[PDB]
Design a protein around this ligand. Structure first.
Ligand SMILES: CC(=O)N[C@@H](CO)C(=O)O
Ligand SMILES: CC(=O)N[C@@H](CO)C(=O)O
Ligand SMILES: CC(=O)N[C@@H](CO)C(=O)O
Ligand SMILES: CC(=O)N[C@@H](CO)C(=O)O
Lengths: 239, 239
């Protein structure tokens, strides 16, 4: 068929959100193409993942947040993303349209946990507005979040790609584009790492703008600052 | 209605499996009963959770695994549980009936991650049988596991309570009672922690055998060994 005889290994250390909503499509198309490549996927917290990759079990690091601290690995930007609001139909916010961050700060919150950017761009959203949010639930999975929202435990704040009406019919989705700054999902990998052809192909599928010539140009650069100062002129995918 | 005016707080640090399949029922019945109790649920890794509770942010610790290392907190046993095998209909194991651990060690594995008992009683299942399992996927969520099984990435090994035919119709469930030793979900909490009445009620809902007189008897005991040497005569719930 349309397969490559490429023999090698690919270890990906990523988070739950990426593994659940962003990767499944890329992974299937990859394994159909590279049958002789042993694909490993491990998950996954921004601290470990940053750990597993710098030294040195995983090849690539797919996460939003804390990678750096590690200055060791090249970083490329994959997409931007922002969170939506999920509530039950009986909840006030399902009646009110276009909500502010002050109106949201009234209710018990059900969001991500500390260490994940779904929060980090959330903690400094209230800090800035001089607000203290009542967060009664923190988790890494949005399904668990969406679960406890249905119980009427509190208002849910999850990634937009984690909520779908076919999948989630009983919940009212409220876009929070303006309320929160968008988060940037990146891909991390050491410089010593020899980039195989299937690795470029994977990066391509996950981030279309990251073609082979683009990756090589960012890699050869001194630091990750020049890399991020290379993409400020281009509009990355928003999901 | 049937509510209590009890005012207080309840912080639960638990894992994903517990929060997704074991707790939702208990949580709803609790919040309906204690409206003036601020219920907080945070998740969750056996190391943190053990951390958040010993010192000292969370009141209770609901996890299978590594709690101890902390000798600080009382432990009570809640239930036993074991894992099942999930595959696609086209997979050989869907044809073969009653599989051994040697027949399972043939395939790429999609199970939990290191630090979670879904693995710990899995790593020493092959070690013992003198076997090396090919684990190509590790995660904390069974939904992600079940997801990548459908891609034909490998054979899935998840908790039995995480698989249901209404919920998961396309996957073939294979019970592994004999293959793996059952894991024990426990509840952890410091001795300094004053046990409120609603706390006993919660423990009761999560573990029926743990009535107030049973909890007090285990708490007052020297160590957690006497506690586990108090329940070897009783058959705990298996889920
Ligand atoms: C179609 C698809 O899989 N898209 C991913 C990104 O590639 C997402 O984030 O939704
Ligand atoms: C950590 C996680 O499960 N999800 C997001 C954060 O919301 C990510 O860091 O990719
Ligand atoms: C009915 C229910 O919620 N049972 C839990 C335990 O209470 C389970 O483990 O399935
Ligand atoms: C850690 C997790 O998500 N689940 C189980 C382990 O399989 C538990 O420790 O309770």
């Amino acid at each position: 068929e349309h397969t490559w005889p490429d023999k090698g290994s690919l270890y990906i250390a990523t988070t739950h959100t990426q593994a659940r909503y962003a990767l499944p499509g890329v992974i299937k198309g990859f394994i159909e193409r590279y049958p002789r490549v042993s694909l490993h996927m491990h998950q996954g917290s921004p601290t470990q993942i940053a750990e597993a990759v710098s030294k040195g079990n995983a090849d690539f690091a797919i996460a939003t947040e804390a990678l750096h601290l590690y200055d060791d690995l090249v970083m490329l930007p994959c997409y931007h993303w922002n969170r939506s609001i999920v509530v039950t139909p009986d909840h006030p916010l399902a009646a009110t349209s276009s909500v502010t961050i002050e109106a949201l700060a009234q209710y018990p919150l059900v969001t991500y946990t500390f260490g994940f950017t779904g929060r980090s761009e959330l903690d400094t959203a209230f800090n800035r507005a001089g607000l203290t949010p009542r967060i009664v639930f923190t988790a890494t999975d949005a399904d668990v979040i969406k679960t406890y929202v249905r119980l009427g435990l509190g208002v849910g704040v999850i990634a937009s790609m984690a909520v779908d009406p076919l999948a989630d019919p009983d919940l009212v989705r409220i876009d929070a584009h303006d309320i929160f700054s968008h988060s940037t999902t990146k891909i991390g990998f050491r410089r010593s790492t020899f980039l195989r052809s299937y690795m470029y192909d994977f990066i391509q599928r996950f981030a279309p703008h990251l073609t082979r010539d683009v990756v090589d140009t960012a890699v050869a650069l001194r630091s990750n600052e020049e890399i991020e100062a290379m993409f400020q002129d281009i509009k990355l995918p928003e999901k």
